[PDB]
Structure 1
Amino acid sequence: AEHLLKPLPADKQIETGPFLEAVSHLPPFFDCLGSPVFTPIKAVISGNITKIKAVYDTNPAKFRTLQNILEVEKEMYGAEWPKVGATLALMWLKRGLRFIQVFLQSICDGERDENHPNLIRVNATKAYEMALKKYHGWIVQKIFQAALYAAPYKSDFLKALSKTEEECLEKIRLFLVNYTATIDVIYEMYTQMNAELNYKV
């Protein structure tokens, strides 16, 4: 029916396996209505999940938590870390996840352009600016801007998730609870561990 993220534990040590399982339900929503223009945002999530899963699967106990991934790979790659392995993949994945969070939260808070109430371009632009734009050069920005501008009508977007709109929005707010908390904890980990990088693609 739905797929909520696990509750945050008190130690804030998110388990890798259930994390990957949960967020693996997110790329299909880019398909529930999607031309190839939206593939760039989808791929920031999808391609990066695949990279992390690959590392985790080699040794699930060693990479049991996301914190484990960072500390283990810091030991493994030394001074090349954190621009390496699953650490780098998750550094980008958290930004894709953040895009989704801000985009969905914006919609749920009833944020819109009064001139275009059935568009979601202001919501998508807001999310892009606060999640991803900072790490994007001019070339990649155009690629993403093309996707953001091709966004579907709000009514079609909500319809697709619900295959009322107010009841749909209610369910998104519930999903956003543990989803938002989890992402914030991952951002905070990256800062705490000095794993965050600022280079642009």
Structure 2
Amino acid sequence: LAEHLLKPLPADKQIETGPFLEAVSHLPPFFDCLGSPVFTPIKADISGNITKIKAVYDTNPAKFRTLQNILEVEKEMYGAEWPKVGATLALMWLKRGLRFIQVFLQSICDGERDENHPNLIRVNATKAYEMALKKYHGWIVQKIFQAALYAAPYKSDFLKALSQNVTEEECLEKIRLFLVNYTATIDVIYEMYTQMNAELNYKV
């Protein structure tokens, strides 16, 4: 996780597309090590969106140099169907998966727990869900998330699975290091969606 740090934001806060895609491509693999087939479609959703944005970038790397460039080019290129089209739409859903991961990891690092059930991660995952995804899901997918939640590993096991023979405390400090530029980048992407009026609130 500290092997594939995101770059810091440059001074103009424009995120280069190519390095962003390379960086977040390291995230989906972690899903194969959570110990459950329940995670397979989740991995596919995030990976799928990365692939869709990459395929749009690959057509013209210079025109799509930055994430901002993607949104503004597609707005011009598509007309009325935008922002519900192309790499803009894929990144809109990608950012919510990335924010989910962010809120979950930060919650774990901040020592948030259920006193009653201390070695579970259900409260951390639930907070992350509420903050990033829930309002974009209809009732059925919410019900599926609730069920899926029970495939979650124990906290102790989750942390050991992300790690080297290293203490839990060491592993968390490494996660905190990863979260610095990760959080800043996602925040800038959310801000970009707001400024460009590209955010949509349809539920699935």
Q: TM-score range by the shorter chain?
A: over 0.9
Where does structure 1 differ by over 4 angstroms across 4 or more consecutive aligned residues? none
Number of residue pairs matched by the alignment: 201
Q: 123-132 vs 28-37, which deviates more?
A: 28-37
CA offset at residue 149 of structure 1? 2.2
Residue of structure 2 equivalent to 1:96 = 97
SS in 1 for 2:190: helix
1:32-73 CA distance string (max 9 Å, x none): 233121234323321110110110111111110000000010
CA offset at residue 83 of structure 1? 0.2
1:67-124 CA distance string (max 9 Å, x none): 0000010011111100000000000000000000000000000000011111000000
CA offset at residue 146 of structure 1? 2.0
- Quote the Cα distance in structure 2 between the aligned partners of 1:41 and 1:103: 15
Q: 38-47 vs 111-120, which deviates more?
A: 38-47
SS in 1 for 2:83: coil
- Quote the Cα distance in structure 1 between the aligned partners of 2:37 and 2:54: 24
> Is residue 40–residue 144 contact of structure 1 (8 Å, CA) maintained in 2?
no
- Quote the Cα distance in structure 1 between the aligned partners of 2:24 and 2:149: 21
CA offset at residue 148 of structure 1? 1.8
Please list every run of 5 or more consecutive structure 2 residues that lacks an aligned counterpart in the other structure.
none
Identity of aligned residues (%): 99
> Is residue 38–residue 148 contact of structure 1 (8 Å, CA) maintained in 2?
no
CA offset at residue 21 of structure 1? 0.4
> Is residue 17–residue 64 contact of structure 1 (8 Å, CA) maintained in 2?
yes
Q: TM-score, normalised by structure 2?
A: 0.95
- Quote the Cα distance in structure 1 between the aligned partners of 2:22 and 2:35: 22
Q: TM-score, normalised by structure 1?
A: 0.97
1:116-163 CA distance string (max 9 Å, x none): 111000000000000000000112112222222210000110011015
Q: 145-154 vs 176-185, which deviates more?
A: 145-154
